[PDB]
Amino acid sequence: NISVDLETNYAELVLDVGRVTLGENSRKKMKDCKLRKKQNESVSRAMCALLNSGGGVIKAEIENEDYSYTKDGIGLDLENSFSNILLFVPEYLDFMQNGNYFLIFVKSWSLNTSGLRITTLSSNLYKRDITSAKVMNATAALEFLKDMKKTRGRLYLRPELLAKRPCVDIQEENNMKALAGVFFDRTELDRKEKLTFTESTHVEIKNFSTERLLQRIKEILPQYVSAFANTDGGYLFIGLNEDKEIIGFKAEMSDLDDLEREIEKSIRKMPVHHFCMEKKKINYSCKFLGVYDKGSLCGYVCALRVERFCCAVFAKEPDSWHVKDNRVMQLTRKEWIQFMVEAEPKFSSAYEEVISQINTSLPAPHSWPLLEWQRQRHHCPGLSGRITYTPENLCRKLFLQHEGLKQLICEEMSSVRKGSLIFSRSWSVDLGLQENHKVLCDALLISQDSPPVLYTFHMVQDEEFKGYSTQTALTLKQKLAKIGGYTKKVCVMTKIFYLSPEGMTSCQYDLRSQVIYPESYYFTRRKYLLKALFKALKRLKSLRDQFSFAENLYQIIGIDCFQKNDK
Amino acid sequence: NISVDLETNYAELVLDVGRVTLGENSRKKMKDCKLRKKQNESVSRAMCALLNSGGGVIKAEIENEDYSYTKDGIGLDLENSFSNILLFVPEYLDFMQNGNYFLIFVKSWSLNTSGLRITTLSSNLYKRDITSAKVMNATAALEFLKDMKKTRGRLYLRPELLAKRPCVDIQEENNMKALAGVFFDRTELDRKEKLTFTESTHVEIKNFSTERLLQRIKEILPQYVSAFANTDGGYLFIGLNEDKEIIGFKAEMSDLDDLEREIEKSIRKMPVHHFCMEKKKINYSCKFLGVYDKGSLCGYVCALRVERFCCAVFAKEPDSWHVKDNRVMQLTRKEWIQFMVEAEPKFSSAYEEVISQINTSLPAPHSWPLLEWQRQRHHCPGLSGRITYTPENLCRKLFLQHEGLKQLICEEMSSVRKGSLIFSRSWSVDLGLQENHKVLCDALLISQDSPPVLYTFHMVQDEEFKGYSTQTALTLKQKLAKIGGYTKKVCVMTKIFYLSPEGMTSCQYDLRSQVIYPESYYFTRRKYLLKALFKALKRLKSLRDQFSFAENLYQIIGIDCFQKNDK
Amino acid sequence: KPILAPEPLVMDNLDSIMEQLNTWNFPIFDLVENIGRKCGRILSQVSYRLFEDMGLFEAFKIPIREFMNYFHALEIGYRDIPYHNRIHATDVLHAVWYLTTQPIPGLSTVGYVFSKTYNVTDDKYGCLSGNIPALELMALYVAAAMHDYDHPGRTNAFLVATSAPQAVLYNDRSVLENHHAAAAWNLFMSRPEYNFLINLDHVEFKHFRFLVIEAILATDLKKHFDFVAKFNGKVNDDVGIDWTNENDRLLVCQMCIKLADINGPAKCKELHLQWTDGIVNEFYEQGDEEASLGLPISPFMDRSAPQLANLQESFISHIVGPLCNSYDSAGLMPGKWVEKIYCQITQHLLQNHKMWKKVIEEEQRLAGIENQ
Amino acid sequence: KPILAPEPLVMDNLDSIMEQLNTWNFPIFDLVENIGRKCGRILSQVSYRLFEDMGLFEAFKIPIREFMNYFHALEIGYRDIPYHNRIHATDVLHAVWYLTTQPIPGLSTVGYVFSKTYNVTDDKYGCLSGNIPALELMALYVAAAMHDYDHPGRTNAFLVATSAPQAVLYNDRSVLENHHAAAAWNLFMSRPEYNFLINLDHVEFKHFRFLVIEAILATDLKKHFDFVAKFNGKVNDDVGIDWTNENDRLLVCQMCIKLADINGPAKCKELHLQWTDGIVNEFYEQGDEEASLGLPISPFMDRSAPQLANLQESFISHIVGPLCNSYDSAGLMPGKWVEKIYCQITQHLLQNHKMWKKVIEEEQRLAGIENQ
Ligand SMILES: O=c1c2cnccc2cc2n1CCc1c-2[nH]c2ccccc12
Ligand SMILES: O=c1c2cnccc2cc2n1CCc1c-2[nH]c2ccccc12
Ligand SMILES: [Mg+2]
Ligand SMILES: [Mg+2]
Ligand SMILES: [Mg+2]
Ligand SMILES: [Mg+2]
Ligand SMILES: [Zn+2]
Ligand SMILES: [Zn+2]
């Protein structure tokens, strides 16, 4: 199975997928196709789960003894799965071999032009093409479900009238459907007789010259039933050959009953989701016809008819995963359809609209950004005005007492071209998490280079707070990417300090010199990070004093507040 | 080639694709793969062209002597192409065999959740997956182009600094890129030596043990160049084998020059589209290395490096077609990218917004629709109030004189449960077309059943006006589907009458008893048709008096006008 | 000097009719004949009864003396014209009190205040007095009381056309509604004995004033389609009416008063006919004064060539129709289940429209016959 | 009885300065010292000169006598306060005349009317007088002239807080702007000799009145972020400014006057300092009158503890900054090519902001040192 890796010093979700062969030649040469497919589906489950829930990292132990990745690649089934889930691969993945492990750093799935909100390995909604039953991909299923939800059901044009047309010898699909219909009501079949119709969008024919015929039906029937129930219904005949000569399967009575019961259970186990007022079920009808040769019964032929449905009909639950708390779980049908159908929520008042569209940055300076403004322009004496100590009332309070703290912050922000650190009594509570009282304060430095750090200060020379800082950095990463709408690669580093009674040193932990990331995780943008932080704090209902933009001017002008969306 | 069929009595675009085999067994058994592929691409061009420009009908002559379509199907390559272009097939296509022809009725491509505005057989924008160069599908190309257009270019993080990381033996794709880079600057190759890197998102290796090697390069190189130029650039080495042992191709000097020149032309013929201020070109560099075995030259190896680009790079022009006037033509690169990138335009003032959202029709009556209102509620004495003679000032004028006209209209609207016919001096001018003065008036009856008719009246016992009426019905169909935003299957029938000096009869033409359509083209909706007519007239700048909704009440209340969008 | 009140506060002879005040077809004119029609005390009495029903005299600790003082000054202020008079204000007040304190099938109730009995034990009917705080409801009631105050008897377009002083004073942007709100609040703040909001906080009073002005300005028919389209785009594509978000509650009160204002063609045929007589008489008066100036006589305002049926049918089809459909698609029209749900208001509306379309067809056909 | 005009229409002694009137740093106070400062005739003279420059006296056939009559009555009407006086109106008029009749690199010119010389032969510079009809431009000029008329010397928030009569008359919704538009148009319509629009049609006059009221109401700073966001959403995601669609031209004139109103921190340092002195003196007066009533003294309006640099820096950063960035991203700020394009206005704005941030840092550091 797949389990979260709780003993890694990464500030991220680290899924452990077990042992996995790698290299293209060795994935090919692997003399066990079943284990190969199992490994592939495991890695793909992990990747989908990390895409649906913030970021992450997939950790797999290199199974074969000799691997390099600079002369072996990854594989060709793994690459196929990766490219199937993601549109553009190098925008979402980064591969890194670290000794005896192969790591895959997964960005978070971001809303794009397609309109998708999650990623699914397979929707399991089958649609009926002209002759073949194919599974709907992401955009097909999206449009299908949105269309069905728009009309609170699915429209039909039930036989109120046949169109008064001219007289002419015309041939259409309705001919094949009607011929198959008269076939369905036929009472006995001459063995080795020819058919007058072929397979179309309402007619599928299957040979199945198998001795068992129970497992094959139980495993293939739901996809054809879901194909028919999603486009116009139709008939399924089992017992013909590829030349339409009636042959039937050689089965005897007392088997027909168990086979019919198996068909019944295999259809009643198929999921379904109604957008309509009432809640019907999959209306169909089984039937068994004899294939009398001369006066004897050469076998039987199974005829099955499925009617058009009012709403969706899955062949299985949708393959969509996410890591809820730990022990990565599959999305439920209600949650999956909720992610697919329901819109994205947003208000975007005009004040916040301008505070966001201050981020144009066309080929020109475009000065005056409203998110990095601060009234007290004088902290940390030896320096210029380039570090906005944001809260301006928590920072001054915290710097008045705790004498070592101001000198520590000055030592820390010396090598920063331009940034803005944001204090707090506890970031864990601001991010909706359990608090611990031993921590003095926190901070969040967001500079041009140097991905965002999370300083955790405290005065207790007994504990470590590594768990606290890592959980907080993890949740901040996930909140940024998911709620804040940051659409690039982020990693929240960490640092822990110890402020004793006149001791302003002893950094007890520096996460940057403990973990190695890919090359692109180190160059953030510092303006979209600020917008993401704004939006995440707003959606979390904890945007209070950060991002000052003082209102002594507004209160004079008369402009109102800008947040706490209940007024 | 493909040519519009000007001698058909359909009120539609009828493309003629020539002779085409049909039936699955005969398309399979056809002993000529080249002709089969040619026929398939021809039908697909026709289908894309009809999808991009209103509706249409594809007409192909059945090539094989014996075809039924009720026992032969269509094929399996044709179905593959159809399903590739369209998401849901039975929503857009209808097949009909009429004697010695096979007709395909194609709905018009309608804006859906995907955001696409046209359909393309192949974008020809290649992207580089982890190891393979694949062509972008519709949604991939859509997101790619929209992203590039948003930033007026394509962002990079040019080597200003390498990220200060810890010290550890880590392996990544940058290793393979750097090794291939040092390979590119190498001066001589030992024949039969091993490589230390494999192929990745920056490195592709090709064997090509061909005697010619010119045609193969000229036909395969542009897709790899477009793959590299669209994601991070990279190197292409030609002259290795599948085991990375350097072999090279056995070519001699005075061939290397012609081969380099062919590479140069094959790269300079590749299209490109810039969203940036300046207009660079595809920066690369060819180079040829010797493969010295012991002291002799065992051949050569061609190394090619492509740099990352600022904007799109096509391998060919995009496969997107449309029928402009006649002689169906391929979309140009500017027009294609304009359809893909630029938004849909719409204003939707609040008055028109309510006049449209009067079409809710939830499970309840929801009376008071504002589009079928009329002040003069008394025409055509023996009847109830169920046919809104819309203009109300052109209709009364036309009925005062032309004595036979009122009795004709009464005879005609007798068998109509509920409709609304809309007169005009000439619908051809209202739809932006050349007028002819011999026609008295026109009309447009839009009932529940009975798809919309186009009555053309005139008093000249010499001419026919079949061309006029068919052109007008054709353009009305296309305008409805494209501009009006009608998202179902429509067909504008026709009728021509003769109003002599006291002769109110002699219907000289009745298009319904001349052409046969599929079964679903006969049941329109009569409310979305009215909304579509409203929007089409508005966008055409000819919405004057149709859809009365009298304003003696508004002028009292004070509400303004509702159209002529320049105020 | 100021208008204080009648000597007895609440009169007793107008009983047995105020108790049948929870019916949509309230016999308002029988009450006008019941109360002394000389002075005019209908609005003050109806307001006292409705507030005492809602218990708002306790939930906000209001003195009844100054309450009656203010509302009597108000009802004295209403000009004595044929339609926009104190009877119209009382009708709108009763309609709002009905729409906000009666069972609404398919509702989800959540310092609120409910009506007198309301017999609320089930979980099938909610009332809007449970989804809307008491302050906002009192604001809606007071706004409905003073919403046509000091009406001149003309339309916005008339005052704008002749460039009346009151139309230049407001720059031709909601002339009448701004005038009503301003004059009513001015009269309120004028005296110290009209102050019946003495036990309100400062922020309470500011929010109350804001909501009252918003409700009054929302009844301008030039904003009709904007309000209707906004309500459509909030219960069609959104989650619906979030009863927590205050802008949603504000929009709900605005639409509630928009529909309680024009409710003539949603009552029985007799009340509807009387209101129609009033409105058309006022239109005729305006047409007289507008022909006296040499202006072209406006449509429907010609007492020599009336088109009353055309006016009322066009009105019911274009204004009251879509408004009721929008207010009902959000599931707010008060009704009952049937053994599926019977809405009396939409029924009355449809019946009145069908009557007018009978009269239209009959007159049209007869004219077409005679004219030949 | 009515204020007619001075005896000579156009004075001659104020020459050689009106010709240097096409410079963004116009020496306005030197002109005030040039014209007789006792009576006050700056606005009327500047208006005559600008209209004669644009030739609008011919394109609309306006009599100069009644023109001077009306504008002299206007300039007499402007209260004599430290900031919102006739000099401010003249400054806004000149700023609008500059922004709409000067070359704008990267424009596409299409009964229009251009400025006096404009030396227009090239295809690189357009002026807004070529994309905007003459009627709308005259409407913008007249609206800028009468936009702070009869200013009481307070803010909207002050009149709303103390519940002034003029704040109840307008229901606390753009009190000052509605008052200005109403009083100006009332004074215009008062006499028959002020009527300088005698040669306009009826629909012409109605559209002119509409545009003038719109421009005047657009200068309310409570609508600042709405206007800025609307202009952003029309030149960022749309095709841009369609010079055919009339709502686009209306939005352009509204933003042009919004920026011409607050243009102190976009001129040279001396003019900016003088305007700042004026505005802060008016704030101090309001603070005196607001402490006299017992209200808490508002921010920045305390003549005992001024925070002038804080006020001006916050203003330049929050209001004038984003407005200039929006007005420039649409490519409408007038500038010139350099051998890439040099915009004097944004330069002045940046320099003034840097000066204020010097003063802020210096005072802040000194206070931090002394306070210890
Ligand atoms: O037919 C009715 C009616 C019928 N029963 C009751 C109330 C009614 C109110 C009105 N009308 C139509 C005219 C009108 C009404 N209110 C206005 C407000 C402004 C301008 C025009 C109008
Ligand atoms: O600093 C300046 C300034 C500086 N130079 C020129 C003009 C200026 C105008 C203003 N302010 C800031 C305060 C303020 C101004 N106009 C208002 C309108 C309403 C409310 C507050 C204000
Ligand atoms: Mg009113
Ligand atoms: Mg009213
Ligand atoms: Mg002002
Ligand atoms: Mg001003
Ligand atoms: Zn269903
Ligand atoms: Zn480019």
Author numbering:
A (entry chain D), B (entry chain B): 2 to 568
C (entry chain A), D (entry chain C): 669 to 778, 800 to 1028, 1070 to 1102
Publication excerpt:
They do so by binding to the PDE3A enzymatic pocket that allows the compound-bound PDE3A to recruit and stabilize SLFN12, which in turn blocks protein translation, leading to apoptosis. The PDE3A-SLFN12 complexes exhibit a butterfly-like shape, forming a heterotetramer with these small molecules, which are packed in a shallow pocket in the catalytic domain of PDE3A.
More recently, two more reports showed that two different compounds, anagrelide, and nauclefine, which target PDE3A, also induce apoptosis through this PDE3A and SLFN12 pathway and that the apoptotic activity of DNMDP, E2, nauclefine and anagrelide can all be competitively inhibited by other PDE3A inhibitors, like cilostazol. One of the most interesting features of the PDE3A-SLFN12 complex-dependent apoptosis is that the pathway can be dose-dependently triggered by many structurally diverse compounds (e.g., anagrelide, DNMDP, and nauclefine) and cause cell death in HeLa cells. To elucidate the molecular basis of PDE3A-SLFN12 complex formation induced by the aforementioned compounds, we treated HeLa (SLFN12−/−) cells with their endogenous SLFN12 was knocked out that expressed Flag- and HA-tagged SLFN12 (K213R) variant with anagrelide, DNMDP, or nauclefine, and then purified the PDE3A-SLFN12 complexes using Flag-HA tandem antibody pull-down. To investigate the molecular basis of the PDE3A-SLFN12 complex triggered by those compounds, we subjected the purified protein complexes to single-particle cryo-EM analysis and determined the structures of the SLFN12-PDE3A complexes with anagrelide (3.4 Å resolution), DNMDP (3.2 Å) or nauclefine (3.2 Å). SLFN12’s helix is positioned at the mouth of the PDE3A enzymatic pocket, and the side chains of its L554, I557, and I558 residues comprise a highly hydrophobic moiety for interactions with the hydrophobic phenyl ring of anagrelide, together with the L910, I951, I968, F972, L1000, and F1004 residues of PDE3A.
